[PDB]
Amino acid sequence: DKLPYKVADIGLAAWGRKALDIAENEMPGLMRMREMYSASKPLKGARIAGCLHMTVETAVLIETLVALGAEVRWSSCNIFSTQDHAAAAIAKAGIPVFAWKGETDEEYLWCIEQTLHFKDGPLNMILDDGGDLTNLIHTKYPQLLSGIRGISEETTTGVHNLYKMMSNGILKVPAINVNDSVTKSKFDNLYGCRESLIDGIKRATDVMIAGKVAVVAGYGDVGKGCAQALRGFGARVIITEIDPINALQAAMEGYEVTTMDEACKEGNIFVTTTGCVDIILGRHFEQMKDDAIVCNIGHFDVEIDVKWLNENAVEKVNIKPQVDRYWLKNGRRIILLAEGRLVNLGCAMGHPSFVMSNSFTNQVMAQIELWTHPDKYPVGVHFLPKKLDEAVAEAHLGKLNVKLTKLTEKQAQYLGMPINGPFKPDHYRY
Template identity: 90%
Template sequence: IGGVHNLYKMMANGELKVPAINVNDSVTKSKFDNLYGCRESLIDGIKWATDVMIAGKVAVVAGYGDVDKGCAQALRGFGAHIIITEIDPINALQAAMEGYEVTTMDEACQDGNIFVTTTGYVDIILGRHFEQMKNDAIVCNIRHFDVEIEVKWLSENAIEKVNIKPQVDRYQLKNGCRIILLAEGQLVNLGCAMGHPSFVMSHSFTNQVLAQIELWTHPDKYSVGVHFLPKKVDEAVAEAHLGKLNVKLTKLTEEQAQYLGLSRDGPFKPDHYRYCLPYNQAFCLPYKNQAYCLPYNCWPWDPWVAQRFGTCLWPRARSWRPGIESHIRLPVHGACFSLCLCLCLSLSLSLSVCDYHK
C-alpha cells in the first residue's frame, strides 16, 4: 500500500511522468496475498518468535481490512478470542457480524495478550497503551513498517531491555510489567519468519509482470496517471494458478454467454465488481453504462460533500481513487440520480421502521 499511496501523491502533485498500474488493489493481489498470505505467515512469525500457546489468549487485531481479516481468522482458528479495533463503520460492522468484539485500542489494551497492528496507518499502539497492557503482552506489526507501534516510547521509557533472541525484545516498564516486542515493530512475518508462502506470492508477482507487459504492449490505452489492472488480466492471473490446486472451471455455453451478455472467455465481472466490499474502496452503482461510485464514508446528502463536490457521485475513471484525484461533477441527471437514491434509502428505512413497530 505504501508504494501505491506514493504514486497517488505524486500524481496529485503533478510529479508522476509515466502511466502506472495499481497492482495492490487488483483482486488477485488484495484478496489473496493480503488475506490468505497473512493468514498463514502471521502465525509463523508469532510461533517462531515466542512459541506461545495462542488458544485461550485474547488477541487484539488493529483494523479489519483484507490483511486484518486474514490475521483475525488465523488467530481465531488457533483458539484465541478476537478483539477488533476499527475507524471505518462498515469494516467494524463486518467484524461484528463475524462474531468479533469491536472496541477501541484504549479499552482493548487492558485485555489483550497478543496485539497485531495491520492498518497501514501511524500511531496505532502508543505509550499510554503499553502502560495498561498485561505482563508479557506480545506486540507485533504485519502491515506498514514500524510506524504503527510507538517503539521509540518503549526505548525511552523502559527501565530494562532484554534481547531474548534475534527479533524478540522484552521491555520492562516502570510499573513492573514487561512487553515483548517482535521484529522491532517491523513486519513480523518477515522479521521472525519466512514471509508468505511462495504460491500466494506468485499471484502478486504475476500481477506485476503482466501489468508491465500491459503497459508496454498497449501504451495508447494508458495516459499518465495511476490505473487499475484490467479485469481480463486479473482473471488470467487467477486462471494461471488453478491447475496447481486441481481446480476445474465450468465453461459457459454459447446460450449462457448470450443470456448473460458475456464473452465465453471473459471478463466475467464488470470493473466495479469487487468480490466483496473492499478495504478503502467505494460502493459502485451502474447508471447509463457507467459505474458511479459512492465512497463508503459519505452520502449524497452529506453537507460537507455537497459543499466541496456538489454531489457525492461521480463517474469512475480507470484511474479513480477516492480523495486524491479531481472529482467530476455530474450533470443534472446525475444530481437527479443522487436524489432518487436518497429517496429510495429513506423509503426503505421508513418501511423497516413501520415493519418493526408492527
Template identity: 70%
Template sequence: MDYKVKDISQHAFGRQEIEIAETEMPGLMAIREQYGDSKPLAGANIMGCLHMTIQTAVLIETLVALGAKCRWSSCNIYSTQDHAAAAIAQSGTPVFAWKGMSEEEFWWCIDQTIEADGWEPNMILDDGGDLTLRMHEKYPELLKNIKGLSEETTTGVLRLEQMVEKGTLQVPAINVNDSVTKSKFDNLYGCKESLVDGIRRGTDVMMAGKVAVVAGFGDVVKEALLVYVELALVFK
C-alpha cells in the same frame, strides 16, 4: 563484483530453495513456459525494491527469462533471506541486500539499483514506495526514461496518492495492491498464513485459546486470527 550480499557461498542452498519454491508458484512458471521464447520484456531495465526472499527470487528469474534486465534491493532492512540474495547474485543479476542492514546501508543499496555504468533504468517495481521516492528526490533527471512503475502495498499506494495530490508524481503508476489477484488471493490467503507464522515465531507461545485484539479488519487480517484463537476483539 556487481552485487553486495552477506555471504555469496550460500548460493547453492538458495538455489535448492528456489527450485522448491518454483513448484509452489505455478503461475510464474506457466508464464515462463508460454512466453520464454518470445522475450516480451526484452528492453525492460527494471529496478526492483522488494523483499529479497526465495519467492522474490522466482519472480526475478521469471522477469529475466522473459527478457528483462534487473537490479534489485530489499524494501525492508530485516526481510532479506541471505541465501536467496546469494543465489540471485550468483546467477548474474545484480542484487544489493542482506538481513540486518542499517538505514544508511538500506538507502545505499537502493542507490546501487539506480546507479551503474551503462545502466538506463526504464521501469520501477516497488514495495512501500521507497525506490519511487528516491528517484523523485535524488534522481529526477532519470524519470524521463521511466515507462511506469508498479506498487505492491497499501503504504506505497498511499504515498503515490499523496504525490498525485501534490502534483509531484512524474511517471505512470500501477496500483497492484488493489488488484483482485493481490487483494483476494495474496492478502487474504498468503498474508494470512505469514502473519500467524510471524506472531508465533516472534512470541513463541501457543495461540490456541488466546484472546486477540485486531486493529483494523482489511483483507490481510480478515479471518487470520479468527482461525487460530478462541476469541478475537475487532476494532475497525
C-alpha cells in the same frame, strides 16, 4: 568501481537454489509467464530497478523477469525481510542484488542507490513495494524521471502514496497499481497473512495462541486474514477500526469491535494492520497484561511507538534476533517483535509461494504492459484489465485440481457475457 552485488553470504547459494526449485513448483503463474514469453523476450531493453523483499518468492520473480529479457538490479524494501539463501542464489546467477537480513537504516538507503545505474544507462522501469524507490527518484533524482517508462507498485501503502502524488501533481511517471488487482488484494493481503502472521509470531516466541485475547488494529484485507488466523487457533479476537463499514463487517463475523484505549487492558497479543501512525502508544503499553506480545504487519514501522519503549523501559533484554523483552517501570514486560517492522517477513518467511505467484504474475504482466504498451498508460495510476486479472487466477487452478465450468452458448447468451469472459463488471468486489 561499483560493487557487483552485496549479500550476507554467497556460499548459501546452493541451499537457496534448492528452495527456489521447490518454490517454482508452487508458482505455476510465474512458470507460465516463462513458458509463454521466454522466446519472444517482451522485456528486452528493460532495465528494471526492483525494491521488494528479497525472499525465495522474489527470486523466482527476478528470474522470470530475466528470462523474459529484462536486465534487473535489486534491493529489499525492508531491513529484516531478506532471506539470505535466496539473495545468494540471485547473486550467484550474476544478477546485481544488494540485500541482506538485518541491514542498518544507512545500508538500506545505500542498497536502493546501487540499483539505479546499469551498464547501458540508468533504470528505465521501477518495480516497487512501498514506494521507497519511487520516492527516491522523484525527490533526489528528478533528472532520471523522463527516462523511466513505468512504475509497478505492490502494496496498499505504496499505491496510497501514488494516488496522493498524482493528486498533488508530483507523480511524473505512469504507474500500475498491482495491489488492487483482484488476484492480489483479495488473495495475498488476505490468505497470505492468514498463514504468515502466526508463522512470524510462533518462530519468534513459540507462544500458545489458544486461550489468549488478541487485538487486531484494522480490519482491511490484512486485518481480516490476521483475525481469521488467530480465531482459528482459539484466540478471542478484538478488532479496532475507524471505518464504519469494515467495523460492521467485523461485528457481523462475531468479533468485539472497540477502541485501543479499551482493548489495551485486555490483549495478550497485539497486531497492527492499519498503515497508519500512532496505533499503540505509551498509554497503552502501561496498561497491558504481563508479557503481552506486540507486533506490526503493516508495510512501514509507524504503527507501534517503539521509541516510547526504548525511552521508558527500565531495560531491554534481547531474547534472540528480532525478539526483545522490555521491562517496564510498572514491573510488567512487553515482548516486541522485529522492532515494530513487518513481523511475517521479519520473524518468519513472509507469505508462502503459492499466493505470491498470484501477486507476482500481476507484477510481470504490469511490467510487460508498461514496457511494451506505453501509449495505453499516460502519467497516472492504472489497473490491469480484468481479462488479465482473471488469467492470473486461471493459471493457478490446475495446481489445485480445480475443474472450472464453461458456459454453454445458450447460457452465455442468457447472461449477455462472452464464454471466455470477462465474467464480472468493473465495480465487482468479489
